[PDB]
Amino acid sequence: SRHVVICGWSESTLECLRELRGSEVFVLAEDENVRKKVLRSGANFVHGDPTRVSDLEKANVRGARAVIVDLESDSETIHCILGIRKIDESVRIIAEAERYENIEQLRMAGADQVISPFVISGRLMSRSIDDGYEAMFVQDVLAEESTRRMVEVPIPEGSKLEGVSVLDADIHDVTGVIIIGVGRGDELIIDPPRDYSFRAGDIILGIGKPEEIERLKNYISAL
Ligand SMILES: [Ba+2]
Ligand SMILES: [Ba+2]
Ligand SMILES: [Ba+2]
Ligand SMILES: [Ba+2]
């Protein structure tokens, strides 16, 4: 119920374990060099072929909290996702796509969230030739968290901000957090209009220093 299955092993999935409890994580892989590394990392190892439905079942993908898929090829990545969806239609699947062409192929396979790090890396490479300021921000906010970080803060039922305009909310002046967007119902609205009214269940996506984030957390609370 709480457990997370990881199909494949890479520096990404390793970094994924940084923020996850390790005894809740089952890593599904065939290779024995991977087994040593998984155990060394304090996570659980399940021997099998992630492109095989039989082994996917054995990994208890059925009731999983989420399944993370990064395999050696976008081909294997796509086949693993297809196999999961034969087992559980509703299970949350997060997958890493290597080639841009295949991002949409991962979605049509049932990936709930796709991440394409080579596409991101490549853009930043070419764009950092003449001006490196976009890359500096990405490194600080999305990687190292030197100063600030992105944050998703949910809006509770008893929230003082319910129904309030984003202009009247003035989240930047109060909190200090730059508001990127607000999502709900698996739909992300970026840079909402001034007349936008907050609803409960809405999630606020923003960027800010640690203190600025606590103030945003504080600002959204019981009436
Ligand atoms: Ba890969
Ligand atoms: Ba091969
Ligand atoms: Ba320059
Ligand atoms: Ba850190």
Curated annotation (Swiss-Prot):
GO terms for molecular function: identical protein binding; metal ion binding; monoatomic cation transmembrane transporter activity. Disulfide bonds: none annotated. Residues 138-222 form the RCK C-terminal domain. It is found in: Cell membrane. GO terms for cellular component: plasma membrane. It is a multi-pass membrane protein. GO terms for biological process: potassium ion transport. Keywords: Calcium, Cell membrane, Ion channel, Ion transport, Membrane, Metal-binding, Potassium, Potassium transport, Transmembrane, Transmembrane helix, Transport. Its main location: membrane. It comes from the Archaea. Residues 1-116 form the RCK N-terminal domain. Ca(2+) binds at D70, E96, E98. Calcium-gated potassium channel. It is not known whether calcium is the physiological ligand. The channel is composed of 4 repeated units, each containing a transmembrane pore part and a gating ring part. The gating ring is composed of eight identical RCK (Regulators of K conductance) domains, in an alternating arrangement of one domain from each of the four subunits and four from the intracellular solution. Two protein interfaces between dimers of RCK domains from the pore-forming subunit and from the intracellular solution hold the ring together. One is called the fixed interface and the other the flexible interface. The flexible interface forms a cleft where calcium binds. Homotetramer. This is Calcium-gated potassium channel MthK.
